[PDB]
Design a protein around this ligand. Structure first.
Ligand code: HEM
Length: 148
């Protein structure tokens, strides 16, 4: 696919600094949906503000985890059938920690936002569309986690 090379190419720049870029993703995500903040409970504590999350080693570790799962999507983009079982469970894990499936659309918008801001001019409509199909496929995988 050429869809698959646009993903690879765009991913390369952000994948070099996953925490920086993942930090953009989650700052955006919290700006769009503040109610996600309380879902990250480390040490039984709740973050009061979005910026509290950025001081938390566990939250930042979660940013690294997120970027690794996305990087696995990019590597396996040509088929992606392959990650179906892993993603189904990851989806269930999130159902368990309290995430609504619908929240993953906001996640998608944050990812696209982060890519757009990092790529600027380079983020062509072909690229936006490729990433939307990829993520749409990804979230379909995950949605199995919700017993659906
Ligand atoms: C609505 C957005 C999200 C919320 C509220 C959320 C929250 C959480 C929480 C509370 C945990 C358990 C604590 C931890 O492991 O740090 C977790 C685990 C994890 N998350 Fe997320 N998460 C979100 C999105 C994502 C996304 C988009 C990805 C990847 C694309 C991801 C990847 C992971 C991974 C790999 C784990 C470890 C699960 C395990 O191995 O047990 N998360 N998430």
């Amino acid at each position: 696919r050429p869809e698959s090379e646009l993903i690879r190419q765009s991913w390369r720049v952000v994948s070099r600094s996953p925490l920086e870029h993942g930090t953009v993703l989650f700052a955006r995500l919290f700006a769009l949906e503040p109610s996600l903040l309380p879902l990250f409970q480390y040490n039984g504590r709740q973050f009061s503000s979005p910026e509290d999350s950025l001081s938390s080693p566990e939250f930042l570790d979660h940013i690294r985890k997120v970027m690794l799962v996305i990087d696995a999507a990019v590597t396996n983009v040509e088929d992606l059938s392959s990650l179906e079982e892993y993603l189904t469970s990851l989806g269930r894990k999130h159902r368990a920690v309290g995430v609504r499936l619908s929240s993953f659309s906001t996640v998608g918008e944050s990812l696209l936002y982060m890519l757009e801001k990092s790529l600027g001019p380079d983020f062509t409509p072909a690229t936006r569309t490729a990433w939307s199909r990829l993520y749409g496929a990804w979230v379909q995988a995950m949605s199995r986690g919700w017993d659906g």
